[PDB]
Amino acid sequence: MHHHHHPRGSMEYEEITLERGNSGLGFSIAGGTDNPHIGDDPSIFITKIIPGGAAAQDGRLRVNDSILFVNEVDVREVTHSAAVEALKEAGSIVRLYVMRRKPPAEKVMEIKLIKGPKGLGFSIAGGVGNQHIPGDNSIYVTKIIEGGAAHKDGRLQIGDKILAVNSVGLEDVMHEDAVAALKNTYDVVYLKVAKPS
Amino acid sequence: GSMEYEEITLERGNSGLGFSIAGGTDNPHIGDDPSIFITKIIPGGAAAQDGRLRVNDSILFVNEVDVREVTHSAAVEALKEAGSIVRLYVMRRKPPAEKVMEIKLIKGPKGLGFSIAGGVGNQHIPGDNSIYVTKIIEGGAAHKDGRLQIGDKILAVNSVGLEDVMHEDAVAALKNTYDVVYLKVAKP
Incomplete structure (x- = not known):
């Protein structure tokens, strides 16, 4: 889109690289243009982290992290479904660019x-x-x-x-x-x- | 382009x-900017000898006076009535x-x-x-x-x-x- 959702707050970006387990990446998401998760925010949010899941073992990733890029895909403005697929077709090694608020x-x-x-x-x-x-x-x-x-x-x-x-x-x-x-x-x-x- | 603030304390010369x-506000110097800009620096002048101050610096405060939004005349007076020791809060852009x-x-x-x-x-x-x-x-x-x-x-x-x-x-x-x-x- 022409204008992106700038967030009030003190923000932090991190690039988390994940190796797909035999059960996916082991975390859940929510939000997107079709089902904004918070206010008017089409951004993708991490809602859950599965224990003993790939994301868990790495442990960098955290709930309420917002996902901006999957590898080289921009998921700031997309439908929920779109993201899920991007997360599937992302191959075995997934570079996540995430943002959240500072402590x-x-x-x-x-x-x-x-x-x-x-x-x-x-x-x-x-x-x-x-x-x-x-x-x-x-x-x-x-x-x-x-x-x-x-x-x-x-x-x-x-x-x-x-x-x-x-x-x-x-x-x-x-x-x-x-x-x-x-x-x-x-x-x-x-x-x-x-x-x- | 690189926003920078500095507090320059000057000791008024005999000039x-x-x-x-x-x-x-009465004579914006650039665009829609009522801000006060330094246009000149006099050689062997108090500001010169200190040398911290530079052209196109913008003046925000003279001592405790706010001069972001004032008439030109207003500033000149603030700069006169500022006594012998003048503390300037200025901003500029590094290029x-x-x-x-x-x-x-x-x-x-x-x-x-x-x-x-x-x-x-x-x-x-x-x-x-x-x-x-x-x-x-x-x-x-x-x-x-x-x-x-x-x-x-x-x-x-x-x-x-x-x-x-x-x-x-x-x-x-x-x-x-x-x-x-x-x-x-x-x-x-």
């Missing part, structure tokens, strides 16, 4: 800070055009300044996602936007943060 | 900051620091025997939608030929350019090829 944060907390004369004494990276991590518009703490408010409080650490400044969310925003959202604060600041996993 | 600007070659490959049964990363939503490098060679597979066609190396930008597959494309799009552009493939590459 959930270790945890989410809220940190109150009181601005030093230097500001909040810490730096950031990330942002929509400025992915600090391939496929991640999130905003991370680049560096914590010694003596700075962030240091004093000591709760905040490097690599923590900053999700919100006060009532301002930083989900998928321009790097400049985030910076602005911080300059435009008063003496007290409530940071909603996410500690990496 | 200002020594650079000129253009743009703003390709590469030499460029074309590599013909003949598909092995495994495909071209190499992997990629990067893409529009998948910046392999902050501010770079370019597509890079993640890994070269041993025995794979790419290895045999030996020309291709890790970290090389792939700019085109046959007649298909990969300038600012979705990661999936690039992958598709490679699956959808025949036994022979012409790769336009860029060595950094």
